[PDB]
Every structure is written in structure tokens, then in C-alpha cells.
Amino acid sequence: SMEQVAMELRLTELTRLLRSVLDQLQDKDPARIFAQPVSLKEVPDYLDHIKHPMDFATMRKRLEAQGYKNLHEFEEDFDLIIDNCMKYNARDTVFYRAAVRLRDQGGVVLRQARREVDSIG
Ligand code: NA
Secondary structure, three states: OHHHHHHHHHHHHHHHHHHHHHHHHHOOOOOOOOOOOOOOOOOOOHHHHOOOOOOHHHHHHHHHOOOOOOHHHHHHHHHHHHHHHHHHOOOOOHHHHHHHHHHHHHHHHHHHHHHHHHHHO
8 A cells, every 4th residue: 555655665764864873873983892793602601691682783784674663773772782781891891981982972863863753753
């Protein structure tokens, strides 16, 4: 039906917006600490600590399949990247501190992204 096509066009345009958001958020991680999933070869106990791992490459895979139906779902995955890092790694590490900075700089991007999603519908 035409109503289904219109819903699919809205999802397509959301996906385009979230791709711009994701690129901007990943620019705030120039070290590429959060670019890939935590390797279970290199960190064998990781799943004992973190139950829902997340990273930018995993988010990009879901995004290109139009897997994010709204901004909240996208935000939940971005928050996992930060929140998992700040639990596993201690306060005095480069990893924890990179997550703090990504959160702080990322909040600026997500604030305006919310306004664009609401405005454009
Ligand atoms: Na901790």
C-alpha cells in the first residue's frame, strides 16, 4: 500500500539523519577506542562483566539495515558504548576518560538531533 511506502520513506530519511549523527559522534573519538567490538580473544572475560557490548561498527551495521526505528533506539546503543566502558575500565584509564569526553561532546550533537527529528517529524 501507499501508506506502507510513506512509512518506509520516513524510516529512510531517519536513517539518513542518523548516519549524519553517527559520523559526527564518531569524530569525537579520534583515538578510535570505540570503533570496533571488544575482542573476546584479547579480553576473554568481557562477557562476564558486560552483558550488552556495543561499538560504532555494530551500530553502523544496524543503521545500514534501517534497524533504528526512532532516535531513542539509536541513543540507547550510543549510551551502551559509553556506559560499558565506564564500568569495565577504572577512572584513571585512557579508556574511561575517552568515554567521558565522547559523552560530553556527543550530548551537544544529540541535543540538536532530537530537535531535528521532532521538527521534521
Ligand atoms: Na568499574
